[PDB]
Write a protein that binds this ligand. Structure first.
Ligand SMILES: *[C@@H]1O[C@H](CO)[C@@H](O[C@@H]2O[C@H](CO)[C@@H](O)[C@H](O)[C@H]2NC(C)=O)[C@H](O)[C@H]1NC(C)=O
Ligand SMILES: *[C@@H]1O[C@H](CO)[C@@H](O)[C@H](O)[C@H]1NC(C)=O
Ligand SMILES: *[C@@H]1O[C@H](CO)[C@@H](O)[C@H](O)[C@H]1NC(C)=O
Lengths: 136, 197
């Protein structure tokens, strides 16, 4: 059982940048996989990025084709905090962003693209990101 | 003083429920309970795990079974078969478990006739459906060989050119490839379903 809580969202002009934070608390010793999801207004939730926590940063991250080269997911194991650096934001990135954690080391996982929703047990409440062409 | 060759262990994950690593130690001149140990690469826990459920064949160890909580898919599995009476006789193998998953055979084969020239076959596989590809074989009682067709994550096959006067037979099997792994061995064949007279 892990408890996640996102932060760092807001409303930014197009082309600007943002950095989300998601602090894990609880049994943070056994959550082997973490990721970011987003939900556009009126649309289904989709996986953005995923990361394996106990790797040596050797191919341990996977991104969606829509955010590849623009978003980077990192993890501070010392402070138990997940991060998602967002640069060159376009209006299509306006969504509610959720972090998720999983403890099932045996679970099959998609090896091409963003994480699926079924691959994570624990979720955060979400943080809102709004990208507009003009200055909000 | 040359150490003897060890048997090669064959590990297979069955429907991500358990793992069977088996070997044949009948080559020993003196029978010996060979021991199994394992760990994972790209893992900060530098600890060696001993086998928790040894498999025996005539009072000697012939394999090991790992529970689901012990399986780390997508992390490199290192398995070490060792001689207890002589620790210098050990062999380590590095395996990728995502290519050694064997699902169970498809179940719940149902046929649904939509029209006089269209019938569909349906099945379920007790597994995440988006991680499996399927092969459908079918033949009539007047066909010398089978007829196979590859079906993707959509578990639906539509029979091309239905003949009501012929009796059909259907079988389906699955494989953990290619979205979530790169397995090469298919599952066993499902029980055959029939249609027509
Ligand atoms: C994996 O290994 C286990 C242990 O040998 C197999 O389970 C045994 O199957 C036989 C089949 O006749 C039964 O008689 C035993 O009672 C079972 N023992 C246990 C502990 O389950 C299992 O069949 C193997 N799996 C595969 C796919 O070969
Ligand atoms: C292997 O271990 C089993 C466990 O009880 C034992 O019965 C058997 O005699 C052992 N065999 C050898 C060759 O040590
Ligand atoms: C087949 O159907 C039965 C009864 O509806 C169900 O209990 C079983 O889970 C089904 N098989 C699979 C693989 O889901």
């Amino acid at each position: 059982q892990v408890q996640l809580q996102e932060s760092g969202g807001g409303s930014v002009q197009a082309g600007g940048s943002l950095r989300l934070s998601c602090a894990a608390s609880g049994y943070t010793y056994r959550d082997y996989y973490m990721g970011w999801f987003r939900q556009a207004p009126g649309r289904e939730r989709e996986g953005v990025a995923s990361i394996y926590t106990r790797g040596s940063r050797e191919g341990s991250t996977r991104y969606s084709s829509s955010v590849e080269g623009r978003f980077t997911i990192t993890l501070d194991t010392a402070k138990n905090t997940l991060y998602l650096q967002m640069n060159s934001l376009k209006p299509e990135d306006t969504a509610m962003y959720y972090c998720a954690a999983d403890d099932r080391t045996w679970l099959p996982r998609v090896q091409l693209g963003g994480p699926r929703e079924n691959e994570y047990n624990y979720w955060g409440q979400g943080t809102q990101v709004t990208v507009s062409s003009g200055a909000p | 003083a040359d150490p003897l060759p060890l048997p090669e262990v064959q590990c297979f994950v069955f429907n991500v429920e358990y793992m069977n690593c088996t070997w044949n130690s009948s080559s020993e001149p003196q029978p010996t309970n060979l021991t199994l140990h394992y760990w994972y690469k790209n893992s900060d826990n530098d600890k060696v795990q001993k086998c928790s459920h040894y498999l025996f064949s005539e009072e000697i160890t012939s394999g090991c079974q790992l529970q689901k909580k012990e399986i780390h898919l997508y992390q490199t599995f290192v398995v070490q078969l060792q001689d207890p009476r002589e620790p210098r006789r050990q062999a380590t193998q590095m395996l990728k478990l995502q290519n050694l998953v064997i699902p169970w055979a498809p179940e719940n084969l149902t046929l649904h006739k939509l029209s006089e020239s269209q019938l569909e076959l349906n099945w379920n596989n007790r597994f995440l459906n988006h991680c499996l590809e399927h092969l459908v074989q079918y033949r009539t009682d007047w066909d010398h060989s089978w007829t196979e067709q590859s079906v993707d994550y959509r578990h639906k096959f539509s029979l091309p050119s239905v003949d009501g006067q012929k009796r059909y037979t259907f079988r389906v099997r699955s494989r953990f490839n290619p979205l979530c792994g790169s397995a090469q061995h298919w599952s066993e064949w499902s029980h055959p379903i029939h249609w027509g007279s």
